[PDB]
């Protein structure tokens, strides 16, 4: 249905004034397609999906030069932030940045994002109108004011509504077989005895794409989150995802409990029951 | 503001010098440029913030430092004649994105020998009677000759007050002998007044040339007078 | 690379001046213009960003074609004070940084519209010496070009405009001199330079 392109950037300083590590990754939907790691040998943007490999040298050289400039910028930023927060050069600090765009089913722009965190906390973000900024702390106001005065948002807005979507469309087309697929979950339930008279029921969803999924338990048709365990959706390692949900029930009452699976690849939601 | 000093400088080849640049504008980004005929503004070094420095497109022969936000000096360890130029410091709120605020400029001449430095000789040439008769106007001309380097400021003073109306000065000096790498220079200016004004013998017209030359501290062993920073003038009085 | 040509431009007072810059990198996204008066520092006068095709500020404007990768400064109804060197720049990523890269500059000259041209060459004597003079070519119309000397020992200045403001009067002039005693003013200001109606006594 809807699709996204996102880039994630992490710059990490080590104590002692050494040079930071910088990692960039790019995603289309739930599929990674490029990387840059400052630790690695190449010092180049690298492919991580088959459909991007066909891009030519001007791509790779261009993405490399831009990402190195991203890196260089963040190296400076880490220093600047230490100043803004009146921090010593004793610790390790982190800058994170994410930006990208969403499109609708019609592949038209829907939404854009451009935001930063410092040491794990929101620092500054472009608001949804792509014309204004949000910065919670005092320290970040300086940045907001610089960027406001230099009309940075206007330039980001043109990328996010424009260029970004164009790239996303290109990747969706070139990576159609991978990206435009839906893999419905393969499901099953397990049962193990617990204590003297209880049992764990576990509802499994495997080999699905995209990652968005809903698993829920009902007791006699009543939704239940109590005594329920839901794990984070996790990568299988092969481009699909996994998830499970479990409940602990008294033995003999297993058949009161139903697991409900919702996913885009499913014509109808699924119900599972232990027998 | 951005504060750059000195405005004019002479050094002999090889003698270390430092050009200062200070700003109190709440700007993190500073940079140095070189301005040369036909080449525009070429970046020497830049500094994105305190203690961050990076080479520009022409860094050779230069160094900088950024130990604090307000200052960004330019160091020439061993000045070369090819570093004779017009230098500009600039600061910015956000490099690459916003207004560059420039300093006043430093005009540096690197000389092979302080012997090559000469103050101007100045002469004033009086209005032609033919012009007076033909136009009822009277043009004075000032000629400043034989100076090196080309670091001069020319002004006209009429009855003791500096004037700008009726004046035009050559934008650039002329080389007296262009094939010489140390050619001395010449510069002209005109002042035009009414013939009536010129014909009053109580009226007084002075061409003043400020020359920027050697300092107090500079050694001087030649027998001519030391060519220090000075004013050289010539004057004419009206004629009935 | 940012290229700015021509190096020099002359325009008549009241007419328009246009200065064009070309650039190499299609990602360039900021394009300022700097004005430098003679002896003074560069100062920003106007700028544009790539999301916009034209921006104006009364008499002056900038137009941008980001596809063709060129942009121009427009100065309408030029005034004498528009005389200056103008530098363009483009901002793009170079060596890991977002950088303003300046063009080579254009020297703009705003010439006066000479009302009643009265071309003349005069010889002027030193207040001090008996033997020294200069030559003055003056009151010519602004389309007149002045050659420089091809003689070792003859010096000719470029044209210069003075404004006698209280008389509402402007005039052009050039000066020449030489140390050769057989020099005449005509050796500098010859009939290939001066017009047929030049007033040239003595």
């Amino acid at each position: 249905g809807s699709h996204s392109m996102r880039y994630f950037f992490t710059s990490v300083s080590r104590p002692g004034r050494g040079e930071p590590r910088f990692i960039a990754v790019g995603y289309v939907d739930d599929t990674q397609f490029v990387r840059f790691d400052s630790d690695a040998a190449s010092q180049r943007m690298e492919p991580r999906a088959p459909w991007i490999e066909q891009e030519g040298p001007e791509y790779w050289d261009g993405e490399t030069r831009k990402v190195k400039a991203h890196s260089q910028t963040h190296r400076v930023d880490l220093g600047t932030l230490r100043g803004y927060y009146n921090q010593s050069e004793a610790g390790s600090h982190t800058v994170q940045r994410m930006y990208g765009c969403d499109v609708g089913s019609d592949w038209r722009f829907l939404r854009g994002y451009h935001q930063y965190a410092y040491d794990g906390k929101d620092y500054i973000a472009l608001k949804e109108d792509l014309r204004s900024w949000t910065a919670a702390d005092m320290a970040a106001q300086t940045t907001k004011h610089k960027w406001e005065a230099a009309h940075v948002a206007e330039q980001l807005r043109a990328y996010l509504e424009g260029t970004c979507v164009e790239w996303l469309r290109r990747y969706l087309e070139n990576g159609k077989e991978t990206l435009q697929r839906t893999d419905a979950p393969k499901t099953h339930m397990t049962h193990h005895a617990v204590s003297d008279h209880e049992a764990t029921l576990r509802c499994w969803a495997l080999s699905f794409y995209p990652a968005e999924i809903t698993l829920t338990w009902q007791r006699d048709g009543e939704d239940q989150t109590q005594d329920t365990e839901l794990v984070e959706t996790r990568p299988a390692g092969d481009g699909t995802f996994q998830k499970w949900a479990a409940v602990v029930v008294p033995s003999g009452q297993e058949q009161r409990y139903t697991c409900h699976v919702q996913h885009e690849g499913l014509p109808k939601p699924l119900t599972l029951r232990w027998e | 503001q951005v504060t750059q000093n000195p405005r004019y400088l002479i050094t002999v080849t090889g003698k270390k010098l430092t050009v200062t640049c200070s700003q109190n504008m709440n700007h993190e980004y500073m940079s140095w440029y070189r301005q040369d005929p036909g080449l525009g503004l070429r970046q020497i070094y830049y500094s994105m913030n305190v203690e961050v420095t990076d080479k520009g497109d022409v860094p050779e022969g230069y160094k900088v430092s950024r130990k604090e936000k307000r200052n960004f000096p330019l160091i020439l360890e061993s000045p070369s004649p090819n570093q004779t130029s017009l230098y500009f410091c600039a600061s910015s709120l956000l490099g690459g994105w916003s207004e560059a605020f420039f300093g006043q400029g430093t005009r540096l001449t690197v000389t092979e020998d302080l012997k090559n430095v000469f103050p101007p000789e100045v002469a004033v040439f009086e209005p032609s009677e033919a012009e007076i008769s033909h136009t009822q106007k009277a043009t004075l001309v000032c000629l400043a000759t034989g100076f090196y380097p080309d670091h001069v400021e020319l002004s006209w003073w009429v009855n003791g007050k500096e004037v700008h109306s009726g004046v035009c000065t050559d934008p650039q000096p002329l080389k007296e002998q262009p094939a010489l790498n140390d050619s001395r220079y010449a510069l002209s200016s005109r002042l035009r007044v009414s013939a009536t004004f010129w014909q009053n013998p109580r009226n007084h017209f002075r061409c003043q040339v400020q020359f920027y030359g050697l300092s107090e501290n500079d050694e001087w062993t030649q027998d001519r007078a030391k060519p220090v920073t000075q004013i050289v003038s010539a004057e004419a009085w009206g004629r009935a | 690379n940012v290229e700015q040509h021509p190096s020099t431009l002359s325009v008549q007072e009241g007419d328009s001046a246009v200065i064009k810059c070309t650039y190499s990198d299609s990602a360039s996204n900021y394009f300022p213009w700097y004005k430098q008066e003679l002896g003074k520092r560069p100062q920003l006068i106007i700028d544009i960003r790539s999301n916009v095709g034209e921006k104006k500020d009364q008499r002056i404007a900038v137009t941008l074609n980001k596809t063709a990768k060129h942009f121009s400064l427009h100065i309408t109804e030029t005034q004498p004070e528009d005389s200056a060197v103008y530098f363009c720049a483009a901002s793009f990523i170079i060596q890991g940084a977002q950088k303003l890269v300046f063009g080579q500059g254009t020297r703009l000259t705003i010439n006066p519209n000479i009302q009643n041209p009265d071309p003349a060459v005069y010889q002027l004597r030193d207040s001090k010496s008996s033997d020294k003079s200069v030559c003055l070519f003056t009151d010519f119309d602004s389309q007149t070009n002045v050659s420089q000397s091809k003689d070792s020992d003859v010096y000719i200045t470029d044209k210069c405009v003075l404004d006698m403001r209280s008389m509402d009067f402007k005039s052009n002039s050039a000066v020449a001199w030489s140390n050769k005693s057989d020099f005449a003013c005509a050796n500098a200001f010859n009939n290939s330079i001066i017009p047929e109606d030049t007033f040239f006594p003595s």
Binding site: T73, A150, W167 | - | -
Partner: peptide, 9 residues
């Protein structure tokens, strides 16, 4: 593709 301009905070 990523942004083709950069800016310091």
């Amino acid at each position: 593709g990523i942004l083709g301009f950069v800016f310091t905070l």
